[PDB]
Design a protein around this ligand. Structure first.
Ligand SMILES: OC[C@@H]1O[C@@H](O[C@H]2[C@H](O[C@@H]3CO[C@@H](O[C@@H]4CO[C@@H](O)[C@H](O)[C@H]4O)[C@H](O)[C@H]3O)OC[C@@H](O)[C@@H]2O)[C@H](O)[C@H]1O
Length: 380
């Protein structure tokens, strides 16, 4: 049974020989540096008395994915002040109040809250909902807009039912229960598949949707088995519903193993840790660690999912190392302890491209310390 059933979370750092005091201080220091560090390290910026944003340093914008990541980090670290500031920013500037995207979030804005595009990013919505449910379960609902579980159910209502009552499209395809890349297009992004979050939506969402969420959890586990290469464990950034790489798009070639796809190994490993349902997740984790076992972080490239390297380097090599190390939650092969130590010995990334690397790094620091947990509807 998983950590959801047992309440016991694997501490991979402790299993590797790091001291409990050492591990707690390292996680606290990662939080301090990421949220409140120097101008070359931090990715969180408070705004006035009641707002704050996660900055995509590389693109000079604020992204729904980043805001939702920050909320998950804050609720996992018991940081309600930062949680509330981030949520108020997303609620105030990004959430649509009308039209085809009502209750969805404009996927990016300028730091000052000016929307740059109206379209939403489903990976943002699902993290907002999961972080808000955990906020409700840890702290209790406050007055709107800090009525966390009510806000979460509103987001997930739109995710399944948008355009039943006028203009818009859902973020899940009703026929296959798979999350989409964007509401309008008939293909997916493997990194967006969070079956472990859908298991929990099946407990917390509007009652009429709980069967759908349970089905989505199983459909996403099956989908990832079709999307990850059976030899390398590599997945494409964009994939068809059948798991094969999607066609080249106007805005780029997403057929290869690059930034988005790094999260798949981390998502697979956390579902295994929480729920322990699909033993394939152990083999997927072993395969990707085997692929990268003798590749130094300094040599990380773009790869075809068949494992053929490009000259082109990885944009976010620290992020890739982070996700390869988080796969140690499920891997039982000869590389698992090596990746945990490689990760421990890697500092937070600095400079203009740091944001994505450091979000993945933080989730890995949470998970490998046994601090990436389910906050259940439970007794005092
Ligand atoms: O500017 C990049 C953008 O990709 C397409 O964006 C989608 C949009 O997806 C979000 C894209 O950003 C993802 O996260 C990035 C991963 O790579 C990192 O280098 C970067 O720092 C991260 O921000 C995020 O996960 C997605 O939610 O979703 C809405 C779509 O309308 C939009 O098309 C844009 O075409 C391309 O410019």
């Amino acid at each position: 049974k998983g950590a959801y059933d047992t309440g016991t979370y694997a501490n991979l750092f402790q299993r590797s020989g790091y001291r409990e005091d050492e591990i707690k201080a390292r996680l606290e220091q990662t939080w301090n540096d990421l949220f409140y560090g120097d101008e070359h390290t931090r990715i969180y910026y408070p705004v006035g008395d009641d707002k704050g944003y996660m900055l995509d340093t590389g693109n000079d914008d604020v992204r729904s994915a980043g805001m939702s990541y920050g909320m998950m980090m804050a609720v996992q670290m018991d940081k309600k002040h930062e949680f509330d500031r981030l949520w108020n920013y997303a609620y105030t500037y990004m959430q649509h109040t009308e039209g085809r995207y009502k209750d969805y979030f404009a996927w990016h804005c300028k730091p000052d809250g000016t929307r740059l595009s109206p379209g939403p990013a489903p990976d943002g919505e699902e993290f907002f909902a999961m972080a808000l449910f955990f906020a409700s379960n840890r702290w209790g609902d406050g007055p709107a807009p800090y009525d966390y579980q009510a806000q979460a159910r509103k987001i997930l209502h739109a995710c399944l039912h948008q355009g039943e009552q006028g203009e818009g499209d859902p973020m899940w395809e009703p026929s296959n229960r798979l999350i989409k890349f964007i509401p309008e297009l008939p293909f997916s992004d493997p990194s967006y598949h969070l079956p472990h979050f859908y298991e929990l939506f099946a407990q917390y969402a509007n009652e009429q949707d709980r069967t759908f969420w349970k089905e989505a959890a199983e459909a996403s586990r099956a989908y990832l088995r079709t999307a990850c290469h059976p030899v390398t464990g590599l997945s494409p950034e964009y994939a068809n519903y059948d798991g094969t790489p999607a066609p080249v798009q106007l805005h780029g070639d997403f057929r290869h193993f690059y930034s988005d796809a790094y999260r798949v190994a981390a998502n697979v490993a956390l579902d295994w840790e929480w729920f322990r349902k699909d033993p394939w997740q152990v083999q997927q984790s072993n395969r990707i660690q085997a692929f990268f076992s003798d590749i130094d972080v300094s040599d990380y490239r773009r790869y075809t999912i068949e494992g053929e390297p490009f000259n082109e380097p990885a944009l976010h090599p620290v992020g890739l190392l982070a996700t390869n190390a988080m796969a140690s939650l499920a891997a039982d092969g000869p590389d698992a302890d090596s990746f945990v130590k490689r990760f421990w010995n890697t500092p937070l990334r600095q400079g203009k491209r740091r944001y994505y690397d450091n979000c993945l790094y933080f989730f890995t620091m949470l998970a490998l310390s046994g601090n990436y947990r389910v906050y259940q509807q439970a007794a005092a």
